Design a protein around this ligand. Structure first.
Ligand SMILES: CCCCCCCCCCCCCCCCCC(=O)OC[C@H](COP(=O)([O-])OCC(O)COP(=O)([O-])OC[C@@H](COC(=O)CCCCCCCCCCCCCCCCC)OC(=O)CCCCCCCCCCCCCCCCC)OC(=O)CCCCCCCCCCCCCCCCC
Ligand SMILES: CCCCCCCCCCCCCCCCCC(=O)OC[C@H](COP(=O)([O-])OCC[N+](C)(C)C)OC(=O)CCCCCCCCCCCCCCCCC
Ligand SMILES: NC(=O)C1=CN([C@@H]2O[C@H](COP(=O)(O)OP(=O)(O)OC[C@H]3O[C@@H](n4cnc5c(N)ncnc54)[C@H](OP(=O)(O)O)[C@@H]3O)[C@@H](O)[C@H]2O)C=CC1
Ligand code: SF4
Ligand code: SF4
Ligand code: SF4
Ligand code: SF4
Ligand code: SF4
Ligand SMILES: [K+]
Ligand SMILES: [Zn+2]
Lengths: 176, 55, 209, 53, 155, 291, 105, 115, 106, 42, 48, 96, 342
C-alpha cells in the first residue's frame, strides 16, 4: 500500500479563490508560523545547567577503561590477552609474565585512548570482568601523552571509580 | 526543565492546539531507573537431550 | 520448527532463477561463460570482458529481463588468478524484482570497456575502480581519480598494497607547509595469525592433485 | 504533535515552498538509470521500497 | 607596584576572552553530529557565550570534529594559519586526537597534532556532548589562567 | 563438537606432578592421550613417563618424583594436544595468535635442524621444530629449543676500545674501524690471523677469508681441528656425513668411533634409535661406555 | 541459540566447558564464514544501502564493498541541477540528504 | 600469451609520440603554474624536474605500460591545470623536508641495518 | 567536508564537479584485516545518522552467509531500532536542510 | 575468434612503475614464497 | 549514597581526585615493563 | 610494597624503576610517576588459608557469576597449599 | 652511549636519533628552526621557556608525541638551569635579546646567563654545549651588543673548555628583523641610511643554513672546543642590498642621507616605546658596523652544509610586503644585487 502525498489540487469557486487570494496577499501561513514560534517562546526552556546538572545516563554507559580487582584486592586480570585480540582499533597492548607469587599478571597493560573507539568489546571479551569501562566521561586532557594510559593509570582508574563500577555491574550483569 | 494558566492559554491559542496533553518535556511519567533484576529467558536449543549439533 | 536457527530455504526462487539463468545463457552464448545460482538464491553470471556493453544492454533493455538499476559496481582483487582483477556488476529489476550479478575478469593492463552508456550511474563507480584497483576503462568519459588524495600513487585496494600505505603528511615549519614523508609508524600493526589449522566446512573442500 | 508542528512551519509556508517547489526536477525514467534510490526514487513517483517488496 | 594594576587589567582581558570564545565548527564526521547535539536545546552551548557559528576570520577556537584525512590536511592548515590570534584548537574524538579507528589507514593522518597545535584533547568516539562541553569549560579555565601582560611586565 | 554443556556434576581435579624446570605440568588438563608415554618409550627411550591407577582417577605421570631430563624432553611440549605440558621458560609470555613465525636453522648443533622462531613485537619468544623428514623429523633438542634466553643475556651492542688503563670502553664505530684498519695496514703477511669460532656464518667466513687474503695472511684457522694429513679438506668425502641423515634408516650395522651422539647430535641419535627400533639395526661402538 | 556464531551467556561462560571454549575462540578467532559472495541490501533512511561481502572461507572476510545511497546521488547531482541558482544547489543537497561519511567511504 | 590488447598505441613509435606532447604540455605549463600557484620553485628548476621524472621510467618497454604512464600523466596535467591540485602536492615532487639519504655501503653500515 | 568545482554563466549552473574523498578513510581496505566481529563497528561509523540501519545491513549479510536466522525477538528489536534510526535520520535531513535554507527553529 | 587487434609482446610485464612502490622498496626488498609449516603444537 | 551505602573495600580511594591534567599532578605515560636484551658488563681487570 | 629508587622514584609492582642516567626521566620532572600503592602481590598473601575439608574444592572467586570461571583445585599435596589460578586464595586441607 | 641513547629509526618523527637537546631559549627565530631539525630527526628536546606556553604551541606540531618536553625556567635561577639540563647530552644556548629590557640588562642575557648556563651544564655532565654569539662581537666595538657578546664568549669558553661557540653573521629568514627591518623602513618615511649607506658591507646567512650547521655540529665528533663562524656565500654593500630587497618587495625606494648622531637620536626616540621597539640606538650602532671577514675561523661549508644565496630565498621573506600589484611576480623579475666579493 501507498499514499499519494501531493495530489490535493484546489477548487476554483469564488470562496476558495477569495481565500487563496487573501492568504497570498494578507499573509496568513506566515502569521501561522510567526505565532507558533511565539508559542514556543513562552514555553519552558529545555536546558540542563552544566556542570551543576548532568545528562541522564544508563548503567551500560561506556566510558573510561579501568582495571578492576577482586574483593581480596588481587587484580582480576590473568592476562589472557583476549581483550587485545578483540579491540578493533588494536589500542590494547599486554606483556605477561610469571609473577613472584606466580599468578600471570601483566607486566605491561596499556590502552591507547586516542586509538580506542569506546565500543565495550574488551569488557564483554574479558572472562574475569577485569577490564571494564567506567561511567566517567570527564577526562578531557590537554596533552596527547595524558591520554595514552598505562597499567598504573588503569589501576588507579579502577581504584577511583570502583563503587561506581561495582554498583553498575551489580545492576547489569544479568542483562549481559 | 508547569506554567501559569494565563501563559498556558496564550501558548495554546498561538500554537492552535492543546499541548498540555503532551509536552516536549518529560516529567515523573518516565520509567524508573532502579528496575528489579530481570530473569532473562533462554533459547530453543536449551534442552539437555536431542540437542545434537549435527541436526 | 525443527530448524529454528538455520535460515529458511526458498527453493521456488532458486528454480525460477535457474530457469532465467538458462534463458540468459541461451540468449547470449557469445560472451557468457558460466552461470550459477548460489544456495541463498543469488544468481551470478560469468561473462567474457567483451560482453560488458552487450550483455548489460540485454539485461537493461529486454522485455523479459527488465533490469534498470545499477545497485553497485565493484572490483575484487585476487593476485592468484592469471587476470587478478574481477569486476562485479549488480543489477536489480523493478518489473520482475530480483537481484542479478554479472562478473568479468581483467588483469592490470588489459582494459575493460566502460559501461556508462548502459547505466549512467556506473560513471562514478567506474572511476572508483580505476582509482582503486588500476583497472583502466576504455573510452570512459572522465576517468580521473575520484577518492584518494591528490597526486596519489598506486591503487590501495590491491592486496599487495600495504595497510598503512607508503607516505604520510604533516606540518613542516622549515618549509611552512604540509609535506609528504615516507612511512614511519609509532606502533606497527600486529598481524594476528587467525584461521585455525583445522578444516571448517567439508562441503567446500578443494579437490587434491 | 511536534512532527505536525514542523509541518505547519514548513509545509504551507510561502518561502519554504517557493525556494523549494519545482526546483531541480528529476525524471522518473532518468531517476532509476542514474542509480538513484530511497526517497529519491519515491519522490519522483516509482512505487518501490525494499521494506515491502 | 605594577603587578596589581597589570594583573587586574589582564585578568579583565582574559575573562573577556574566556567568556566569549567563538568556535569554528569544522565538523568532519560523526563528531560533528555530536557537537551539533551539544548545541541543541539540552546542553545549549550558546548559553556560555560560545556562539558555535563563526566564520574563520571571526573565531577564537577550532574544534577538529572527526577524522582528518590527507586530502583535508592542506585545507585545515590554510584555515588555521588564517585564524587570528589568540587561537586555541581543541581536538574532539579519538580520530582527531590521534589515529582513531582508522589509525593504520593510508589517507588519514594519525592525529590533528601532526597538522595543527591542539590545546585540549577531548576523548570519545564520539565524545558525548557534555564531554565536549566539559572540554570547552577546561579551555575556559585555561583562558582564566592567562598571564600575558604579567609576562610582558616581567619579561 | 557441541555448543553447550550438559555436565551437571562436579569435575575431576588431579594434583600436579613436577617433572622439571623445562616442562610446565598441569595434569588436571590432561586427556590421557598417551602421546607423552609413547614418546618417552620409543623416541626418547627414557621409559619413566607412564600411567597410574585406573578408571577416571587414572593419572599419567611418573609416580615417583623422578627427573625426566633426556635430551629430547622439550618435544613433549609439542606432542601434548592440551596445555597439560607446556614450556616453563616461555610460560605465559605471549598468546600464540600474535607471534609472527619466521623459518630458520638451528646452529647449536651441526645437525642444523630446521626450526621456526616465534617473534612478537621485535623480540624472540620461543623456537619450535619445523618438519623436514630428512634432518629433524619434527623434533629438536632441548638445547636447541630453550636457548633463546641466551640472546637476552650478556650481549655486545656497541664497539669498544681499550682506554689508557686497558679497559674496553664504549665508542662509536668510526674509531673502531679506524684502529682496526690502521694496524691491519701496518702488518702484512702471516703476522695477521683469524680463528673462526663455532656459531659463525658462511658469508662472513668468505668475507673474512677474502679480506685476510688481500694481505696474503693465510692462517685462517678454526676452533675444531681436523687431521689435514693426506687429503685433509681437499675432498668432500673426507669431512662429511656422506650417507646423509636419512641413509641411516636403511643401514644394517653402525659403528660409533668413540662419540656421544645422545649429546653430540640428539637428532642423529634419534634417527639411529628409530632405525634400531623399526629396521632392527645392530648398533655397536668402540670407545667410552656412554649409555 | 547456536553458540558457535554468537557468544554464550556469561552464566554458562563461567560454569560450562563448552561455553568457555566457544567464547574464547569466538573472541580470539571468530566464526569462520563459509566461502561465498553476497550483495545484501536494505532500505536505509537515506536510501537503499548495500554490502557486497565476499568471504574466502576463513575467520576473516576477503572483501567488503559499501553501496552507500549517497554515492549514485552525488554522481547524478550534475544532472540534478542544470540551470538552477546556487541557492538552489544548496536547496538540492538538502533533500539530496548527502552525509559525507558514507558516500566517501 | 605474447599477443595482447593495446590501450591506444600500436607500437613504440606512437606511444613515443604521446609522451612527446605530454612533455609539450608540461613545458608550456611549468612557468604559469609557477606564477599561478605562487611556487618557490624556479622556472628552470621546474622544467628539469619534469625532465628527470620523464627519465625516471626510462626502462619501460611494454607498450601498454607506456599508455598507462601517459594517461596517468594526463590525469596529473588536468589536476594541475584547473587548480584542483594544491601547492603542497606540487611541492611533493620536490623532496625538501626529506633528509638526504646516503648511497655508499660504508654510510649504510654506519647508519643501521639496511641493504 | 565537500568540494564543488562549479562552472556557471553567473547564476544558472552550467556544470558542477563534486570532489568526494575529502573525508577518505581506508575502511574498505581496513575490513579485510579484522574479523567480522571486529569489522562490525566500521558500519556503525560509516553512515553516522543511520547507525543501527547500517549495522542491520551488515549483520543481515553476515548471517545470510551463515544460513542462520536471528531469533524472532531479535528481529523485532532490530526493526524497532531501525525505525528509531529512520526517525533520527529523517530529522537530520529535514532540520539541517531547513538550516541551510535559513530556518533555525525546526 | 577474439579479434581485438592482438599484438605479440614477448618481454615480460613491467607493471613495477605502475604499482607506485618506491624505488628502494622495489629494489632492496627480497620476498620469499613458501608453504607455511604447521604449528607443531597442533 | 546516604540511602544506598556503596560497598566499602580496602583498595578504594578515600579521597576523590578531579582530573589532574594541566597541573603538575598530571599523569605522564611511561613504559611499565622491565628491560629487553641486557648489555654485557666489561671486565675491570687490566687488559693483560 | 612500594619502595623508592636510588634516584628517588617509586618502584612499580612490576619492578620498573628508571636507572641513574636513564635520560627518559625528564618526563617526570614537574610531574609525577603515577604508581598504584595497592600492590596485588602482597594484598593476596595476607589472606587466610582456607581450611575446607574435602579432596577437591570448587572456586569461582566469590560473587557467583561476578567471579572468575569455576575451577576445581586439588587439595591433595600435603607439602603445599592449593590455589585457584584466577583469584589466588590459598586452599588447604585442615591439616588432613 | 646509554642504552636508551643508541640511534634507532630512519630519521623520521619516531626515529630515536640518540640526541637529548636542551635548546635554551628556543621560543624564537632560529630556536623555532633548530627544534624542527631536532624534532624531525627524532630527539627528546627539553625546550625551556619563560613566556606563556601560547607562544610555544607552534613547537607542538614539529615533533612526535612524547618529545619537546616543556619545562619552566627562570633566568636568575641556577636551580631552573639545573632542572632543565639535569638529563641531557647536549645543551644549546640561544637565549639573546635585541632591545634592552628595563628589567634585563644587556650583559646578563649575554654573559651572566651564558656563564650560568655553562657552569651548571658542565657540573651536570652534558657532553657538548653550543653557545651562539654574533660574529661581529668585538671587545671594544662601539655597540655594547657586540662587546657584551665578546665577554660572554670568553666567559663561556673559560667555564666550558669544550663548548662549540658559534659566531653567526646577520641572519635572515621569515621573521628576521633584518630583511623585514629595512623592508618596513619605508613605514618610517624614506629609508634613513647613515650617510646614505654606501660604506657598509653585509654577509647574511639563511636561517636554515645556520640551524643545519648547529645540527651537524651536534653530530660532528670534532666540534668540541672549536669556534665556528657562519657567513654567507656572497656579500653585499648595504645600499645595493636595500635596493635589492626593495625591488623584490617592489615598494618605491627613497634613500635618505643621515648623520650618525641623527640616527642615534632617532634610535633613542624609538627606545622609549613600551613593547618591542622597531629600532634601538644599539641597533643603529650595529647596522652601520660592517661584518668583518674571519678566514681563520672555520666557516660553514667545512661542517658540510652548502650556503644558500640570498637571491634564491629572498622571495619568501619579502613576499608578504609585496602589494597585490606585484604579489603575483616571481624571482627572476629581480636581478641579483651587485655583490662586492673578495
Ligand atoms: C509584560 C511584563 C509584565 C511583568 C512580568 C510579568 C511576568 O511575566 O511574570 C511572570 C508570570 C509567570 O510567567 P510563566 O512563564 O508562566 O511562569 C512559569 C513558572 O511559574 C515560573 O516559575 P519560577 O519558579 O521560575 O518563577 C520565578 C520567576 C518568575 O518571574 C518573575 O517573578 C518575574 C517578575 C519579577 C520577580 O522569578 C524569578 O525566577 C526571580 C528572578 C527574576 C528575574 C528578573 C525579572 C525582571 C522582571 C521585570 C522587572 C522590571 C523591569 O507571568 C504571568 O503570570 C503573566 C503576566 C502578564 C503580565 C502582562 C503585563 C502587561
Ligand atoms: C579596553 C581594553 C583594556 C585592556 C587592553 C588590553 C590589551 C591586551 C593586548 C593583547 C595581549 C598583549 C598584551 O597584553 O601585551 C602585549 C605583549 C607584548 O610583549 P610580549 O613579549 O609579552 O609578547 C609576547 C611575545 N612575542 C613578542 C614574541 C609575541 O604580549 C603579551 O602580553 C603576550 C604574552
Ligand atoms: N640575525 C640574528 O637574529 C642573529 C642572532 N644572533 C644571536 O641569536 C640569538 C637568538 O636570536 P633570535 O632567536 O633571533 O632572538 P629572539 O629575540 O627572536 O629570540 C630569543 C630567544 O631566547 C629567548 N630569550 C631572549 N631573551 C631572553 C631573556 N632575557 N630571558 C629569557 N629568555 C630570553 C626568547 O624567548 P622569549 O621570547 O620568551 O624571551 C627566544 O626563545 C641571540 O643571542 C642573538 O644575538 C646572532 C647573530 C645574528
Ligand atoms: S572500547 Fe576497549 S576494547 Fe574496544 S577498541 Fe576501545 S579500548 Fe579496545
Ligand atoms: S580480557 Fe580481561 S583478563 Fe584477559 S587480558 Fe584483557 S583484561 Fe586481562
Ligand atoms: S572518533 Fe569516533 S565519532 Fe569521532 S570521527 Fe572518529 S569514529 Fe567518528
Ligand atoms: S601428552 Fe599430555 S594430554 Fe597426552 S597423556 Fe601425556 S600429559 Fe596427558
Ligand atoms: S586452552 Fe585447551 S589445554 Fe588450555 S585449558 Fe582450555 S581446553 Fe585445556
Ligand atoms: K602442548
Ligand atoms: Zn579463585
Amino acid at each position: 500500500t501507498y499514499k499519494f502525498v501531493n495530489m490535493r489540487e484546489p477548487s476554483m469557486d469564488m470562496k476558495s479563490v477569495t481565500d487563496r487570494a487573501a492568504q497570498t496577499l494578507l499573509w496568513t501561513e506566515l502569521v501561522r508560523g510567526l505565532g507558533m514560534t511565539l508559542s514556543y517562546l513562552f514555553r519552558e526552556p529545555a536546558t540542563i545547567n552544566y556542570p551543576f546538572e548532568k545528562g541522564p545516563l544508563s548503567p551500560r554507559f561506556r566510558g573510561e577503561h579501568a582495571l578492576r580487582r577482586y574483593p581480596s584486592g588481587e587484580e582480576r586480570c590473568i592476562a589472557c590477552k583476549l581483550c587485545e585480540a578483540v579491540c578493533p582499533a588494536q589500542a590494547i597492548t599486554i606483556e605477561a609474565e610469571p609473577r613472584a607469587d606466580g599468578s600471570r599478571r601483566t607486566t605491561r597493560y596499556d590502552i591507547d585512548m586516542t586509538k580506542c573507539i569506546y565500543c565495550g568489546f574488551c569488557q564483554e571479551a574479558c572472562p574475569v570482568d577485569a577490564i571494564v569501562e567506567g561511567p566517567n566521561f570527564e577526562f578531557s586532557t590537554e596533552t596527547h601523552e595524558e591520554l595514552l594510559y598505562n597499567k598504573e593509570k588503569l589501576l588507579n582508574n579502577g581504584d577511583k571509580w570502583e563503587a561506581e563500577i561495582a554498583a553498575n555491574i551489580q545492576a547489569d550483569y544479568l542483562y549481559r | 526543565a508547569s506554567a501559569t494558566r494565563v501563559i498556558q492559554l496564550l501558548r495554546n491559542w498561538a500554537s492552535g492546539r492543546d499541548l498540555q496533553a503532551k509536552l516536549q518535556l518529560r516529567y515523573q511519567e518516565i520509567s524508573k531507573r532502579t528496575q528489579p533484576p530481570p530473569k532473562l529467558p533462554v533459547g530453543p536449543s536449551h534442552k539437555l537431550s536431542n540437542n545434537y549439533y549435527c541436526t | 520448527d525443527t530448524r529454528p536457527t538455520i535460515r529458511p530455504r526458498n527453493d521456488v526462487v532458486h528454480k525460477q532463477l535457474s530457469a532465467f539463468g538458462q534463458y540468459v545463457a541461451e540468449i547470449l552464448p557469445k560472451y557468457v561463460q558460466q552461470v550459477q545460482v548460489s544456495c541463498f538464491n543469488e544468481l551470478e553470471i560469468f561473462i567474457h570482458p567483451d560482453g560488458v556493453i552487450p550483455v548489460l544492454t540485454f539485461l537493461r533493455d529486454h522485455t523479459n529481463a527488465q533490469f534498470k538499476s545499477l545497485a553497485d559496481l565493484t572490483a575484487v582483487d585476487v593476485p592468484t588468478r592469471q587476470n587478478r582483477f574481477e569486476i562485479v556488476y549488480n543489477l536489480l529489476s523493478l518489473r520482475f524484482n530480483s537481484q542479478i550479478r554479472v562478473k568479468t575478469y581483467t588483469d592490470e593492463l588489459t582494459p575493460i570497456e566502460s559501461s556508462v552508456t548502459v547505466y549512467k550511474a556506473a560513471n562514478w563507480y567506474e572511476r572508483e575502480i580505476w582509482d582503486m584497483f588500476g583497472v583502466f576503462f576504455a573510452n570512459h568519459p572522465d576517468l580521473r581519480r575520484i577518492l584518494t588524495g591528490y597526486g596519489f600513487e598506486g591503487h590501495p585496494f590491491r592486496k599487495d598494497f600495504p595497510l598503512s600505505g607508503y607516505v604520510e603528511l604533516r606540518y613542516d615549519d622549515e618549509v611552512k607547509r604540509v609535506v609528504a614523508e615516507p612511512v614511519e609508524l609509532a606502533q606497527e600493526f600486529r598481524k594476528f595469525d587467525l584461521n585455525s589449522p583445522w578444516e571448517a566446512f567439508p562441503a567446500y573442500r578443494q579437490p587434491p592433485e | 504533535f511536534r512532527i505536525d508542528e514542523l509541518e505547519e512551519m514548513l509545509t504551507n509556508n510561502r518561502i519554504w515552498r517557493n525556494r523549494t517547489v519545482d526546483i531541480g526536477v528529476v525524471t522518473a525514467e532518468d531517476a532509476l538509470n542514474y542509480g538513484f534510490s530511497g526517497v529519491m526514487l519515491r519522490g519522483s513517483g516509482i512505487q518501490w521500497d525494499l521494506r515491502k517488496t | 607596584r605594577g603587578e596589581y594594576v597589570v594583573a587586574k587589567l589582564d585578568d579583565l582581558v582574559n575573562w573577556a576572552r574566556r567568556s566569549s570564545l567563538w568556535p569554528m565548527t569544522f565538523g568532519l564526521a560523526c563528531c560533528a553530529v555530536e557537537m551539533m547535539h551539544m548545541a541543541a536545546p539540552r546542553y545549549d552551548m550558546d548559553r556560555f557565550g560560545v556562539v558555535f557559528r563563526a566564520s574563520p576570520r571571526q573565531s577564537d577556537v577550532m574544534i577538529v570534529a572527526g577524522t582528518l584525512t590527507n586530502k583535508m590536511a592542506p585545507a585545515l592548515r590554510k584555515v588555521y594559519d588564517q585564524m587570528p590570534e589568540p587561537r586555541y584548537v581543541v581536538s574532539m574524538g579519538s580520530c582527531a586526537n590521534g589515529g582513531g579507528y582508522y589509525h593504520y589507514s593510508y589517507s588519514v593522518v594519525r592525529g590533528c597534532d601532526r597538522i595543527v597545535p591542539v590545546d585540549i584533547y577531548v576523548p570519545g568516539c564520539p565524545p558525548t556532548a557534555e564531554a565536549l562541553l566539559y572540554g570547552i569549560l577546561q579551555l575556559q579555565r585555561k583562558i582564566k589562567r592567562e598571564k600575558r601582560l604579567r609576562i610582558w611586565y616581567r619579561r | 563438537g557441541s555448543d553447550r554443556s550438559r555436565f551437571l556434576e562436579g569435575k575431576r581435579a588431579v594434583e600436579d606432578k613436577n617433572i622439571g624446570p623445562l616442562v610446565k605440568t598441569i595434569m588436571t588438563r590432561c586427556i590421557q592421550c598417551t602421546r607423552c608415554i609413547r614418546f618417552a618409550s620409543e623416541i626418547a627411550g627414557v621409559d619413566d613417563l607412564g600411567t597410574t591407577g585406573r578408571g577416571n582417577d587414572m593419572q599419567v605421570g611418573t609416580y615417583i618424583e623422578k627427573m625426566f631430563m633426556s635430551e629430547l624432553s622439550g618435544n613433549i611440549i609439542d606432542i601434548c594436544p592440551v596445555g597439560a605440558l607446556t614450556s616453563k621458560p616461555y610460560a605465559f609470555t605471549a598468546r600464540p595468535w600474535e607471534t609472527r613465525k619466521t623459518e630458520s636453522i638451528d646452529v647449536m648443533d651441526a645437525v642444523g635442524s630446521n626450526i621456526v622462531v616465534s617473534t612478537r613485537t621485535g623480540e624472540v619468544m620461543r623456537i619450535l621444530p619445523r618438519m623436514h623428514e630428512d634432518i629433524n623429523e619434527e623434533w629438536i633438542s632441548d638445547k636447541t629449543r630453550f636457548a633463546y634466553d641466551g640472546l637476552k643475556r650478556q650481549r655486545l651492542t656497541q664497539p669498544m676500545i681499550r682506554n689508557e688503563k686497558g679497559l674496553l670502553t664504549y665508542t662509536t664505530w668510526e674509531d673502531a674501524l679506524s684502529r682496526v684498519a690502521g694496524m691491519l695496514q701496518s702488518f702484512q703477511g702471516n703476522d695477521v690471523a683469524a680463528i673462526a669460532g663455532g656459531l659463525v656464518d658462511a658469508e662472513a667466513l668468505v668475507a673474512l677469508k677474502d679480506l685476510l687474503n688481500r694481505v696474503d695472511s693465510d692462517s685462517l684457522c678454526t676452533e675444531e681441528v681436523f687431521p689435514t694429513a693426506g687429503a685433509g679438506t681437499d675432498l668432500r668425502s673426507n669431512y662429511l656425513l656422506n650417507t646423509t641423515i636419512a641413509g641411516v634408516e636403511e643401514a644394517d650395522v653402525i659403528l660409533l668411533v668413540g662419540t656421544n651422539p645422545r649429546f653430540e647430535a640428539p637428532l642423529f641419535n634419534a634417527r639411529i634409535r628409530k632405525s634400531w627400533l623399526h629396521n632392527d639395526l645392530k648398533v655397536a661402538l668402540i670407545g667410552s661406555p656412554v649409555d | 541459540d547456536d553458540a558457535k556464531v554468537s557468544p554464550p551467556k556469561r552464566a554458562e561462560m563461567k560454569t560450562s566447558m563448552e561455553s568457555l571454549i566457544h567464547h574464547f575462540k569466538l573472541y580470539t578467532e571468530g566464526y569462520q564464514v563459509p566461502p561465498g559472495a553476497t550483495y545484501t541490501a536494505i532500505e536505509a533512511p537515506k536510501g537503499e544501502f548495500g554490502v557486497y561481502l565476499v568471504s574466502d572461507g576463513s575467520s576473516r572476510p576477503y572483501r567488503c564493498k559499501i553501496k552507500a545511497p549517497g554515492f549514485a546521488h552525488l554522481a547524478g547531482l550534475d544532472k540534478m541541477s542544470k540551470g538552477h541558482m546556487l541557492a538552489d544547489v544548496v536547496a538540492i543537497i538538502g533533500t539530496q540528504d548527502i552525509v559525507f561519511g558514507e558516500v566517501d567511504r | 600469451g605474447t599477443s595482447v590488447k593495446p590501450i591506444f598505441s600500436r607500437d613504440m613509435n606512437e606511444a613515443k609520440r604521446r609522451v612527446r606532447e605530454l612533455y609539450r604540455a608540461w613545458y608550456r605549463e611549468v612557468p604559469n603554474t609557477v606564477h599561478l600557484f605562487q611556487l618557490d620553485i624556479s622556472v628552470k628548476q621546474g622544467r628539469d624536474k619534469v625532465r628527470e621524472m620523464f627519465m625516471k621510467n626510462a626502462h619501460v618497454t611494454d607498450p601498454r605500460v607506456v599508455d598507462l604512464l601517459v594517461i596517468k600523466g594526463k590525469m596529473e596535467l588536468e589536476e594541475t591545470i584547473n587548480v584542483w591540485k594544491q601547492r603542497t602536492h606540487i611541492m611533493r615532487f620536490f623532496h625538501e623536508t626529506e633528509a638526504p639519504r646516503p648511497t655508499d655501503f660504508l654510510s649504510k653500515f654506519y647508519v643501521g641495518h639496511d641493504p | 567536508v565537500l568540494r564543488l568545482v562549479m562552472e556557471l554563466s553567473g547564476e544558472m549552473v552550467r556544470k558542477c564537479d563534486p570532489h568526494i574523498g575529502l573525508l577518505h578513510r581506508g575502511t574498505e581496505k581496513l575490513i579485510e584485516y579484522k574479523t567480522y566481529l571486529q569489522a562490525l563497528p566500521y558500519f556503525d561509523r560509516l553512515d553516522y545518522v543511520s547507525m543501527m540501519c547500517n549495522e542491520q545491513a551488515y549483520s543481515l549479510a553476515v548471517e545470510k552467509l551463515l544460513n542462520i536466522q536471528p531469533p524472532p525477538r531479535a528481529q523485532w528489536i532490530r526493526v524497532l531500532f531501525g525505525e528509531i534510526t529512520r526517525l533520527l535520520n529523517h530529522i537530520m535531513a529535514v532540520t539541517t536542510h531547513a538550516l541551510d535554507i535559513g530556518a533555525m527553529t525546526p | 575468434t577474439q579479434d581485438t587487434q592482438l599484438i605479440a609482446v614477448d618481454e615480460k610485464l613491467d607493471i613495477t612503475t605502475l604499482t607506485g612502490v618506491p624505488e628502494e622498496h622495489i629494489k632492496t626488498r627480497k620476498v620469499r614464497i613458501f608453504v607455511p609449516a604447521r604449528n607443531n603444537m597442533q | 549514597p546516604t540511602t544506598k551505602p556503596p560497598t566499602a573495600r580496602k583498595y578504594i580511594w578515600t579521597n576523590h581526585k578531579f582530573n589532574v591534567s594541566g597541573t603538575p599532578q598530571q599523569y605522564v605515560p611511561y613504559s611499565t615493563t622491565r628491560k629487553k636484551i641486557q648489555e654485557w658488563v666489561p671486565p675491570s681487570t687490566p687488559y693483560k | 610494597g612500594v619502595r623508592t629508587s636510588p634516584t628517588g622514584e617509586k618502584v612499580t609492582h612490576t619492578g620498573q624503576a628508571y636507572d641513574d642516567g636513564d635520560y627518559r626521566r625528564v618526563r617526570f620532572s614537574d610531574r609525577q610517576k603515577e604508581v598504584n600503592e595497592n600492590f596485588a602481590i602482597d594484598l593476596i598473601a595476607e589472606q587466610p588459608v582456607s581450611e575446607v575439608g574435602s579432596r577437591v574444592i570448587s572456586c569461582d572467586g566469590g560473587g557467583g557469576a561476578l567471579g572468575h570461571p569455576r575451577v576445581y583445585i586439588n587439595l591433595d599435596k600435603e607439602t603445599k597449599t592449593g590455589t585457584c589460578g584466577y583469584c589466588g586464595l590459598q586452599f588447604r586441607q585442615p591439616h588432613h | 652511549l646509554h642504552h636508551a641513547l643508541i640511534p634507532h629509526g630512519k630519521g623520521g618523527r619516531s626515529s630515536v636519533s640518540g640526541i637529548v637537546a636542551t635548546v635554551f631559549g628556543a621560543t624564537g627565530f632560529l630556536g623555532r628552526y633548530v627544534v624542527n631539525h631536532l624534532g624531525r630527526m627524532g630527539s627528546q628536546v627539553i625546550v625551556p621557556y619563560r613566556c606563556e606556553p601560547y607562544d610555544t604551541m607552534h613547537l607542538r606540531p614539529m615533533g612526535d608525541l612524547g618529545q619537546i618536553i616543556f619545562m619552566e625556567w627562570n633566568g636568575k635561577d641556577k636551580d631552573s638551569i639545573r632542572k632543565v639540563v639535569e638529563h641531557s647530552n647536549v645543551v644549546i644556548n640561544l637565549v639573546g635579546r635585541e632591545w634592552e629590557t628595563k628589567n634585563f640588562d644587556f650583559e646578563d642575557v649575554f654573559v651572566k646567563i651564558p656563564h650560568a648556563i655553562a657552569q651548571v651544564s658542565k657540573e651536570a655532565g652534558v657532553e657538548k654545549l653550543i653557545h651562539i654569539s654574533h660574529l661581529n662581537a668585538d671587545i671594544k666595538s662601539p655597540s655594547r651588543y657586540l662587546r657584551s657578546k665578546a665577554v660572554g664568549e670568553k666567559e663561556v669558553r673559560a667555564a666550558f673548555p669544550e663548548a662549540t661557540i658559534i659566531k653567526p653573521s646577520d641572519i635572515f629568514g621569515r621573521e628576521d628583523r633584518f630583511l623585514n627591518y629595512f623592508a618596513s623602513m619605508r613605514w618610517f618615511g624614506g629609508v634613513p641610511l647613515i650617510s646614505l649607506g654606501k660604506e657598509t658591507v653585509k654577509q647574511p646567512v639563511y636561517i636554515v643554513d645556520v640551524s643545519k650547521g648547529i645540527i651537524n655540529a651536534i653530530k660532528d665528533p670534532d666540534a668540541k672546543g672549536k669556534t665556528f663562524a657562519f657567513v654567507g656565500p656572497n656579500r653585499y654593500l648595504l645600499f645595493d642590498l636595500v635596493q635589492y630587497i626593495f625591488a623584490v618587495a617592489y615598494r618605491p625606494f627613497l634613500p635618505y642621507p643621515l648623520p650618525h648622531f641623527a640616527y642615534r637620536w632617532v634610535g633613542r626616540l624609538f627606545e622609549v616605546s613600551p613593547f618591542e621597539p622597531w629600532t634601538t640606538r644599539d641597533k643603529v650602532e650595529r647596522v652601520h658596523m660592517s661584518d668583518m671577514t674571519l678566514p681563520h675561523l672555520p666557516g660553514l661549508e667545512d661542517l658540510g652544509i652548502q650556503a644558500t644565496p640570498l637571491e634564491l630565498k629572498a622571495i619568501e621573506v619579502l613576499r608578504r610586503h609585496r602589494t597585490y600589484r606585484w604579489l603575483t611576480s616571481e624571482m627572476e623579475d629581480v636581478k641579483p644585487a651587485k655583490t662586492v666579493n673578495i
